[PDB]
Amino acid sequence: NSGLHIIIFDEIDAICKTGVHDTVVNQLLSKIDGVEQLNNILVIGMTNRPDLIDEALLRPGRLEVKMEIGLPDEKGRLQILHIHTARMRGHQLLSADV
Amino acid sequence: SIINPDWNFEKMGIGGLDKEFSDIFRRAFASRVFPPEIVEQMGCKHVKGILLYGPPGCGKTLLARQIGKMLNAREPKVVNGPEILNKYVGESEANIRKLFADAEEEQRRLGANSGLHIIIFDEIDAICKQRGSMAGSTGVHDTVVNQLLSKIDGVEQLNNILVIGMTNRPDLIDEALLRPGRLEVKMEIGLPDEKGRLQILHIHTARMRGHQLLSADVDIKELAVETKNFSGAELEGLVRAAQSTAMNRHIKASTKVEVDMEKAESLQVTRGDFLASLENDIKPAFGTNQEDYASYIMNGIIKWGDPVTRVLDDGELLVQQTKNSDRTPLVSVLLEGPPHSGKTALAAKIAEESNFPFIKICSPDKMIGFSETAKCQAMKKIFDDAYKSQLSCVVVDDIERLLDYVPIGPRFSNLVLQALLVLLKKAPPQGRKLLIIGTTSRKDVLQEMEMLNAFSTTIHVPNIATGEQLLEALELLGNFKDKERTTIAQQVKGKKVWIGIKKLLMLIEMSLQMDPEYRVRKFLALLREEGASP
Ligand SMILES: Nc1ncnc2c1ncn2[C@@H]1O[C@H](COP(=O)(O)OP(=O)(O)OP(=O)(O)O)[C@@H](O)[C@H]1O
Ligand SMILES: Nc1ncnc2c1ncn2[C@@H]1O[C@H](COP(=O)(O)OP(=O)(O)O)[C@@H](O)[C@H]1O
Ligand SMILES: [Mg+2]
């Protein structure tokens, strides 16, 4: 009985690909594989090159589910601009004409 | 001794593979069970490897680990094929060298008393100077497979190794790697039949039975006769998906309804979850794909007259001939007709009504922008997959577009034509059947390219040729409110109507875009304008 630890990683594609890559990837895989049996592992990672990452990292039980973030969205762009300009209006410095 | 003479392979692992074990152990490893004294007196050497091939994910590595353990061997040293390959010069071979070190040292200090080391490979075909024969430029050095051979059997001899290799494509394995003294015993791991699909299911669901989590509703014989050509990994995924869906259902239901704790603890999965997941979640790879039919038979099949029944009956007769006859295990047929006459839908229906285990459709919609060699590779892969089932049915969607035919010139690709012409006359391995259905709109061109001599029969898909047939089709399609239909019947009594069904659908839909006044005249004008005759 314990809480969940959330370890964030960025740019996994760089390491996944001169013999250092294989050993590093295997060392990372060792813990999640099940030998170290860690049942408290939330590994939310980030990357920009889905084609330069080992598919073993996404083998069932490794990464499983994935998602991508798209354009800022026209309505989402409106919402973010609204948030920033509301922070601005917090002191009413912004002119009403805008 | 290393094992009792009768061995044992069950209930601890391997499922439907029991004959395989006895076969392999009687053929090859008979030199490690006989009393050592007679083995020494005879003076015989032991085999130095074996090869296993078959479909992907059918239970090969499990057998390798079991055979390694049951010989009283050290821990296996697994390694993957494509991973040992580097762009640097002379570094794809150091990786191969770095796997025999410990065995070398142990043989060095202790001679003729060491144990056994198993060096299980995987995708052994990646390193081979034979993939370059197929169109392309991938030479893979051809030095890699000269550093592995020189270590197994060279000037220096090792007598404490056993190399086991696995591959999916047995036709790209270099020939220098199968002579006596090297990998020298082949073996096949096929798809699991009924008894295997029963044993695997029983094995994979014992835990949930132990605690009575499973309800008494679910059986296993029913689920062992519905899953046709499933591979074991698919069965495991099916069980996992059933568990997950039942869990989600129970949490959602008990949350929405403030049920008493009695059913809240209870997490029975029942059988509804099993069927739901089976019919909605898991999609086999060597079985029927019931989803894509809805993308071809979009508006059902209407019986506007006589020809439909004739075509369907002929298809039934050919299916029956291919099912239950010998001396003729390969059968072909060709459907042809004028454009927009509905040739693809009839082919899909004929294929679907066969109830075969393996059904596949090879259409050009998924080869946009492909180079011709890619088309050849895709066709060959589909046929190879079709060769691995007792009964099969492969459809070719449009033969005039696969060749890139264009009336100017004429021009087309020769490679695809020759590949198809060779593939139409190649019998499958002994004891297996097949059926091929073509489709095209230009019979004369295929007749001219000497292609109509390879097919075994032909069927004609006629067009709407009389006013009465058009009237019946319109009546069954249910439009024009039956009062404008009287005027239509009066107008179309000429009997000089030559139109296709798909074009008829398009024309009706287009004419239905006006007010009730001008609709009939617009439709009649459109029909008259497009009223070209043979
Ligand atoms: N009796 C029928 N036979 C065939 N198709 C029918 C019939 N009744 C309705 N249809 C509908 O007609 C359409 C069949 O058109 P299809 O795509 O097969 O045309 P095609 O002649 O193969 O086309 P193309 O030559 O351009 O490749 C589908 O919508 C099918 O639902
Ligand atoms: N005969 C079988 N009985 C039980 N499980 C099996 C069987 N064959 C395969 N499996 C399952 O498949 C997985 C192993 O697949 P594997 O045979 O290693 O694929 P590959 O041949 O590509 O290496 C295991 O999780 C195992 O549970
Ligand atoms: Mg067509």
Curated annotation (Swiss-Prot), chain A:
Subcellular location as annotated: Cytoplasm
Secretion signal span: none
Assembly: Homohexamer. Interacts with GABARAP and GABARAPL2. Interacts with GRIA2. Interacts with PLK2, leading to disrupt the interaction with GRIA2. Interacts with MUSK; may regulate MUSK endocytosis and activity. Interacts with CDK16.
Function of the protein: Required for vesicle-mediated transport. Catalyzes the fusion of transport vesicles within the Golgi cisternae. Is also required for transport from the endoplasmic reticulum to the Golgi stack. Seems to function as a fusion protein required for the delivery of cargo proteins to all compartments of the Golgi stack independent of vesicle origin. Interaction with AMPAR subunit GRIA2 leads to influence GRIA2 membrane cycling.
Family of this protein: Belongs to the AAA ATPase family.
Name of the protein: Vesicle-fusing ATPase
Swiss-Prot record, chain B:
Primary localization: cytoplasm
Catalytic activities: ATP + H2O = ADP + phosphate + H(+)
List of residues binding ATP: 299-304, 339-346
Entry annotated with the keyword Electron transport: no
The keyword Iron-sulfur appears for this protein: no
GO molecular function term, any single one: PDZ domain binding
Residues modified as Phosphotyrosine: 53
One Gene Ontology cellular component annotation held by this UniProt entry: Golgi stack
Residues engaged in binding Mg(2+): 344
EC number: 3.6.4.6
Family note: Belongs to the AAA ATPase family.
Listed name of the protein: Vesicle-fusing ATPase
Organism of derivation: Cricetulus griseus
Lineage: Eukaryota, Metazoa, Chordata, Craniata, Vertebrata
Residues of the full protein shown: 207 to 740 of 744
